[PDB]
Structure 1
Amino acid sequence: SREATLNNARRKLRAVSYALHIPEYITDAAFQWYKLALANNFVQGRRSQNVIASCLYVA
């Protein structure tokens, strides 16, 4: 359900995190930030590259 979407988001955030050369704690910080943002229903239907890049950019 929603956990599969957060798993896909965690894999994409893992990809952008290990590609952008950031440490491992800020990956979990961006993950909980994306979880809070999706709890606030901030965006839908994007290609998700811009979304994960923007969340990792603010984190």
Structure 2
Amino acid sequence: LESREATLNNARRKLRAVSYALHIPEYITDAAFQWYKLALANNFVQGRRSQNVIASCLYVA
């Protein structure tokens, strides 16, 4: 959906946001994007807070 595209393009900003803070090079940030991509599809993103579901996401990468 376009709303599905609009919420990831919103989230594309936010995982890139903390990568600037922690001096994260880009190949972690793009690699963690797929982990958020599947966890959105696997109905994990609903209910939890937005900043909590991305901070837990990129630590795995």
Q: TM-score, structure 2 length as denominator?
A: 0.84
Where does the alignment leave 5 or more consecutive residues of structure 1 unmatched? Answer: none
What value does the CA root-mean-square deviation take over the aligned residues?
1.1
Q: Alpha-carbon deviations, 1:10-50, whole Å to 9, x = none?
A: 10001011112111011111111100111111121433111
- Further displaced range: 24-33 or 43-52: 43-52
How many residues align? The count is: 59
Where does the alignment leave 5 or more consecutive residues of structure 2 unmatched? Answer: none
Larger radius of gyration: 2
Give aligned-pair identity as a percent: 100
Q: TM-score, structure 1 length as denominator?
A: 0.87
